[PDB]
Design a protein around this ligand. Structure first.
Ligand code: MG
Ligand code: MG
Ligand code: MG
Ligand code: MG
Ligand code: MG
Ligand code: MG
Ligand code: MG
Ligand code: MG
Ligand code: MG
Ligand code: MG
Ligand code: ZN
Lengths: 56, 224, 106, 55, 129, 88
RNA sequence: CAAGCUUGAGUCUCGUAGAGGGGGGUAGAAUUCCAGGUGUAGCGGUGAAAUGCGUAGAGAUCUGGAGGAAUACCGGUGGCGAAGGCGGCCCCCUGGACGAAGACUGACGCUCAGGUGCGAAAGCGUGGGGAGCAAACAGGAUUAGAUACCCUGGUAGUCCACGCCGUAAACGAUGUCGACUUGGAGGUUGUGCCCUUGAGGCGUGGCUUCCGGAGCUAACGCGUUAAGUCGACCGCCUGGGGA
């Protein structure tokens, strides 16, 4: 998520862009995911569970 | 009724392929546009055969309960039912109307007490809340029990619009040995029905056709 | 005979040896009775990311029909040769003989 | 039909930071998703595409 | 593998019957045809046919009564894993005689009743009621 | 597996012709060839257990064919194994 | 017992998909470390702290280099394998599965006590390797205690080769093979047909996920991938503790 402010665009709008670029890019989610070791069995467990919830 | 006569109303139209109940394989012509098309070759003789037994039942002073609570057709079932001096259920069927008739019968007494009192007993001197509050009760009872209010006993037959929608009523009948005549659409279960009439059970044009036919044959069976 | 798509990219400072490397490679394929089916000298081209602190590098493309022995010789001599900063042989189910998107893209 | 050399087509399927776009977003068939990712991976090694926005 | 084709026959009948099927069909064999004969003659099926010469397919027309299957039970008795033979004076009867047992004798396949009356014993192929 | 030229060749050698592609002798020759080629493979790749289960299948399968043949025509069997240099 | 038969089972041809196996190369991200430039008083860690690290200049930033280990995105009730299990890219060696068409062999089949082989992790032996993680162990905390949970470190081990071990909730807690029995919505992967005239229209195989019908079941639930209806062969159970 690289951003370049355009002319006569307020610092705020550019910022809001930037934060949404990272929301889009999944940075913090990604960093959260890796802060700590997850066992393979555990991430397979997570994967099934979300497949399941993704039925409405 | 005629094969030609039925086809116009769209009796032949059914539900989609995806919603069918397999038991109804025999009565489906085939399908087009992902919609099941019922067999009118099968419908008419079966329907006529339904009318005959109804005609017989009506000719021994048999009481016929029309059942169809779809909002779209609720009125048509009433006029159809009243046109032949019989009884109906045209809004949500109260479970146990037949199987628990002794208890539901009390509500009928309540109905009559209420419309009688509101007219001959008249009141109209009220408290100002009772006018609507008693009408409230009377209003409710009327939709629920307006059609069977004078039925007196258990009916001798049921005629039903949509066997799946009205599965409750057809099940009570089954338990009481009361024969069930029903419009049974491609998606429904024909097992509860003694005389299965397979055709559309939604479209007001189709509904009125069977019903218009049903009420007419009662009068013939009545007129003797 | 197996078919291969070969790509090798040469250190720009040695771009002048590239003619010779082609002549030689061909001769070892024709020499093992293989065929050569498509050859594109892409010349210098900008890199997507730096490699060995280089931007740009001479590219060459080759589609070839040849045995394992000569293909073996080619994979090693690409390691050997220090001019070749990156290379890749990939197997292909059949010959190819249309311009690559590179020829068209210019 | 898909070739790692067709960087024009390959670009439609990567993000601003050169990350492969999942089949979900693109709505690309599952057989070819794989074919694409193998051509994007091939194209990356040959520096015809970036791995990351960094470089 | 397919080591008892008679159980297979019994079962194809039983299951198609349970599935209110109009007919059932199976690879043919003299022994199947001999059993089908007894079933038909005792009124447990309508009729049967075998079609083809080199790969004969046998077909049984099932039978229904009060929207019910005429065949109430149909079970294998003797079997590849345990052959059952009986003597004339030991011949079982099914449902106290209301059903039948199919018996294979020196004089071909017939019912318990038939074999009894003809002074014979045999391999007890199945019960039917 | 065996090459189409090397497969076709054995069928010629042990079959009634080019199309006698399923005779017992042919089937057993083809298995023989592939077993002996794979002798080379597992010499270098001892840790390729998965492939080996496939080789072991070719073996157990050739064994069943040889027994059937022996049962049905011992004379055809002796020739076949001597010719393939088997049994020791 | 003898001759057969072609539908079971094989063989042949051409293709398809795949983290199936083994070997060899190679890539870019990051951590840690080494060497420097800029910079200066903190960094780090926690619930709060302290141990720890930094004026021998840390941390932060930029640059170059060493090394090991794992391969983001793709990625998915996706795929492959007998099971264990298998995921960056490329090549080489190799096993299995499936489809289309027709030819060939002619019951060559199913199951399998004993036997043989495979078999996660931890563990063992010899020699390598060693970034990160981390049993043991040390130190700081918490606590009434705290041989723990948390923090700062950190050895075996985790990695490679060649041997050993032979066990797991090694699970679908469901043995293998075959035949038969209503349906709906999807995923995946072959293949025949249709102005390919649209990212489609009509069929036909393999695998798979979610519902559900009869039937089954103590119930939960299973339900054409059966826990339904049958047959062939094997393994196993016979109250709890003791074990
Ligand atoms: Mg680094
Ligand atoms: Mg293969
Ligand atoms: Mg023959
Ligand atoms: Mg060790
Ligand atoms: Mg610790
Ligand atoms: Mg040790
Ligand atoms: Mg155990
Ligand atoms: Mg279910
Ligand atoms: Mg149920
Ligand atoms: Mg005990
Ligand atoms: Zn309807």
């Amino acid at each position: 998520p690289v951003i370049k402010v355009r002319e006569n665009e307020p610092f705020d709008v550019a910022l809001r862009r930037f934060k949404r670029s990272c929301e889009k890019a999944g940075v913090l989610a990604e960093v959260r995911r890796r802060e700590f070791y997850e066992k393979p069995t555990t991430e397979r467990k997570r994967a099934k569970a979300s497949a399941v919830k993704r039925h409405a | 009724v005629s094969m030609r006569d039925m086809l116009k109303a769209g009796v032949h139209f059914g539900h989609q392929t995806r919603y069918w109940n397999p038991k109804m394989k025999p009565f489906i012509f085939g399908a087009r546009n992902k919609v099941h098309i019922i067999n009118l070759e099968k419908t008419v003789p079966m329907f006529n055969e339904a009318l005959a037994e109804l005609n017989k039942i009506a000719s021994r002073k048999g009481k016929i309960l029309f059942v169809g609570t779809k909002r779209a057709a609720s009125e048509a079932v009433k006029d159809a039912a009243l046109s032949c001096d019989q009884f109906f259920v045209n809004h949500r069927w109260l479970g146990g109307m037949l199987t628990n008739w002794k208890t539901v019968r009390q509500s009928i007494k309540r109905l009559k007490d209420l419309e009688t009192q509101s007219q001959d007993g008249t009141f109209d001197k009220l408290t100002k809340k009772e006018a609507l509050m008693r009408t409230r009760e009377l209003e409710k009872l009327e939709n629920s029990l307006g059609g069977i209010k004078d039925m007196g006993g258990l009916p001798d037959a049921l005629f039903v619009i949509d066997a799946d929608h009205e599965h409750i009523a057809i099940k009570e009948a089954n338990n009481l040995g009361i024969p069930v005549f029903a419009i049974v659409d491609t998606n429904s279960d024909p097992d509860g029905v003694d005389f299965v009439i397979p055709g559309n059970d939604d479209a007001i044009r189709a509904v009125t056709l069977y019903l218009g036919a049903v009420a007419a044959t009662v009068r013939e069976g009545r007129s003797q | 005979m197996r078919h291969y798509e070969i790509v090798f990219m040469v250190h720009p400072d040695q771009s002048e040896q590239v003619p010779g490397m082609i002549e030689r490679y061909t001769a070892a394929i024709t020499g093992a009775e293989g065929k050569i089916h498509r050859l594109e000298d892409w010349g210098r081209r900008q890199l997507a990311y730096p490699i060995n602190k280089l931007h740009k590098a001479h590219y060459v493309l080759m589609n070839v029909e040849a045995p394992q022995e000569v293909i073996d010789e080619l994979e090693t001599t690409f390691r050997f040769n220090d001019a070749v900063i990156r290379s890749m042989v990939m197997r292909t189910k059949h010959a190819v003989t249309e311009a690559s998107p590179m020829v068209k893209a210019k | 039909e898909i070739d790692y050399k067709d960087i024009a087509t390959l670009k439609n399927y990567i993000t601003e930071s050169g990350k492969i776009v999942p089949s979900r977003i693109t709505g690309t068939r599952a057989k070819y998703q794989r074919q694409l990712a193998r051509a994007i991976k091939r194209a990356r090694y040959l520096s015809l595409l970036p791995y990351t926005d960094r470089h | 593998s397919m080591q008892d084709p008679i159980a297979d026959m019994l079962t194809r009948i039983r299951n198609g019957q349970a599935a209110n099927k109009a007919a059932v069909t199976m690879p043919s064999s003299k022994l199947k045809v001999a059993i089908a004969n007894v079933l038909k003659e005792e009124g447990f099926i309508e009729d049967f046919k075998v079609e083809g010469d080199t790969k004969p397919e046998l077909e049984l027309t099932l039978k229904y009564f009060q929207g019910k299957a005429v065949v109430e039970s149909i079970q294998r008795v003797s079997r590849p894993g345990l052959r059952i033979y009986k003597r004339k004076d030991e011949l079982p009867k099914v449902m106290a005689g209301l059903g039948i047992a199919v018996v294979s004798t020196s004089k071909g396949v017939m019912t318990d009743r038939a074999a009894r009356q003809a002074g014979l014993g045999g391999e007890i192929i199945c019960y039917v009621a | 597996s065996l090459s189409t030229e090397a497969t076709a060749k054995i069928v010629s050698e042990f079959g009634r012709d080019a199309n006698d592609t399923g005779s017992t002798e042919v089937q057993v020759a083809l298995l023989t060839a592939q077993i002996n080629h794979l002798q080379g493979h597992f010499a270098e790749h001892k840790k390729d257990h998965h492939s080996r289960r496939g080789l072991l299948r070719m073996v157990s399968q050739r064994r069943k064919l040889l027994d059937y043949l022996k049962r049905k025509d011992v004379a055809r069997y002796t020739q076949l194994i001597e010719r393939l240099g088997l049994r020791r």
